[PDB]
């Protein structure tokens, strides 16, 4: 019931993503996965769980933007 | 030798650090045998050791980019540098002249080396000149050099090992401009078209004067695919055990 609200909102991001082509388009992609993954991390084993993927995306920015940086 | 002053000045900077820890161990320890505020105050000196180098090094990285230790702003001489396996290639675009495994340059004249390599990635070290930058197969890298004084400059390759790579030592001589203008040609053989393809095989070679430039062949600095049209057009691909000796099909110019 509560998860149906996020699933319906996620579909609009992909439809709006096609409208961008057919920064400004690099943040809608991460925001699509923020709502997708925020319904199953906290808590109990949280903080470490949601924190492990936090610096993992840091490496994704470091590896991608670092390779393009040359 | 522009960065050599860094090496000598930094050598004493770390020689102090080596003796500092001699005073932090040998002074006590022997005396001390059976028979919170200091750490935070220590964080003022370690940047001072690196920030005294995080400025002149950065003031030198940007220094080797633009016109370096030579001309100031005139006399633009270009020398295309290509590196085959074992063997080194240098072509002069100024006049149709092309030399391999030997190079002569005028003192106090800038030489804009265009660096690339055909068969394997490599880099023209030339230890007396100083900075050396990789020759990447697929693109040409611009590098500026000069010859400080007249002499015999040993030159070499970084030797990313590949069997016959140790004897990549090509001695380069740098003489006066007056002798160079007579020597810019010895006598500008010629570009025999086929002998260029006879170079990409990794063996041993002598001087080979060649009085004509090769940049008329796919630039070579661009389109590094000139490795299949080289070793394979003459029928040759090596292995590790037996049946080598360039798998048959002769025609070349070797030693002895």
């Amino acid at each position: 019931x509560x998860x149906x609200x996020x699933x319906x909102x996620x579909x609009x991001x992909x439809x709006x993503x096609x409208x961008x082509x057919x920064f400004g388009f690099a943040f809608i992609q991460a925001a699509l996965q923020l709502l997708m993954f925020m319904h199953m991390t906290e808590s109990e084993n949280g903080t470490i769980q949601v924190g492990n993927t936090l610096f993992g995306f840091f490496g994704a920015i470091v590896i991608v933007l670092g390779s393009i940086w040359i | 030798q522009q960065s050599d002053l860094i090496l000598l000045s930094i050598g004493f900077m770390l020689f102090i650090v080596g003796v500092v820890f001699v005073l932090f161990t040998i002074i006590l320890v022997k005396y001390r045998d059976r028979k919170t505020f200091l750490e935070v105050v220590w964080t003022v000196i370690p940047i001072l050791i690196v920030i005294a180098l995080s400025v002149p090094t950065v003031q030198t990285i940007y220094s080797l980019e633009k016109a370096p230790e030579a001309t100031k702003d005139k006399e633009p001489l270009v020398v295309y540098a290509t590196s085959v396996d074992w063997k080194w290639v240098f072509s002069y675009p100024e006049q149709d002249i092309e030399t391999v495994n030997y190079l002569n340059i005028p003192v106090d004249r800038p030489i804009l080396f265009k660096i690339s390599s055909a068969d394997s990635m490599a880099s023209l070290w030339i230890p007396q000149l100083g900075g050396q930058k990789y020759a990447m197969a697929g693109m040409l890298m611009d590098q500026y050099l000069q010859a400080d004084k007249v002499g015999t400059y040993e030159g070499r390759n970084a030797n990313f090992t590949g069997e016959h790579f140790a004897d990549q030592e090509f001695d380069v001589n740098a003489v006066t401009e007056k002798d160079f203008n007579s020597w810019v040609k010895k006598t500008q053989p010629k570009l025999t078209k086929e002998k260029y393809d006879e170079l990409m095989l990794p063996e041993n070679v002598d001087e080979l004067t060649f009085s004509s430039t090769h940049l008329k062949y796919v630039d070579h600095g661009q389109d590094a695919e000139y490795a299949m049209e080289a070793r394979k057009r003459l029928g040759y691909q090596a292995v590790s055990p037996h049946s080598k000796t360039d798998p048959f099909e002769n025609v070349k110019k070797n030693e002895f």
Binding site: X1, X11, X14, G56, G59, S67 | -
Partner: protein, 178 residues
């Protein structure tokens, strides 16, 4: 209580660096194809692929929350986990015919350097979603001589969140390659 939910969770964070390495490889090999075929792919197939997977998580975000957590639909495990299992074959079947149709000029990784990354950035991509189907159906063999209760049969949740990590880079691929 099982720590496998967290141990196999930091493994999902390791795959972030796994796909970032392939994304760094692909983004540098983007301006190549100096001698080959220029990329021109079907647009509607990309949305159909993404909309099928965006509805795949739609039937899975509420597939364990209003399933095992809210109330107790033990009979619905052969319903919600099976329907979400057929959608996994939709992405596999569509990507296979996408690769088979790519045989017509631009086949495999031998035509150009760019197509090497695309067929690999979507390669293990296609492998991770393929082994997940055999992992989601591997836990479905429990409603027989086992049939464990929630908060005990962790095999469903640890395989559901790994299945959720796919759509993370799946959309990042949608913006990455397209």
């Amino acid at each position: 209580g099982r720590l496998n939910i967290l141990g196999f969770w930091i493994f999902l964070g390791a795959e972030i660096v796994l796909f970032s390495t392939l994304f760094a490889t692909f983004f540098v090999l983007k301006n190549r194809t100096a001698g080959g075929v220029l990329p021109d792919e079907l647009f509607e197939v990309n949305l159909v692929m993404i909309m099928t997977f965006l509805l795949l998580i739609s039937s899975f975000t509420c597939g364990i929350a209003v399933h095992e957590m809210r109330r107790g639909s033990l009979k619905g495990v052969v319903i919600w986990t099976i329907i979400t299992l057929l959608l996994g074959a939709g992405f596999v079947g569509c990507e296979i015919n996408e690769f088979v149709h790519y045989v017509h000029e631009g086949a495999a990784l031998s035509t150009s350097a760019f197509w090497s990354g695309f067929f690999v950035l979507l390669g293990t991509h296609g492998t991770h979603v393929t082994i997940g189907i055999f992992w989601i159906t591997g836990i479905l063999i429990q409603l027989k001589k086992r049939g464990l209760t929630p908060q005990t049969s962790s095999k469903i949740f640890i395989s559901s969140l790994y299945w959720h990590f796919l759509d993370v880079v799946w959309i990042f691929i949608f913006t990455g390659v397209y």
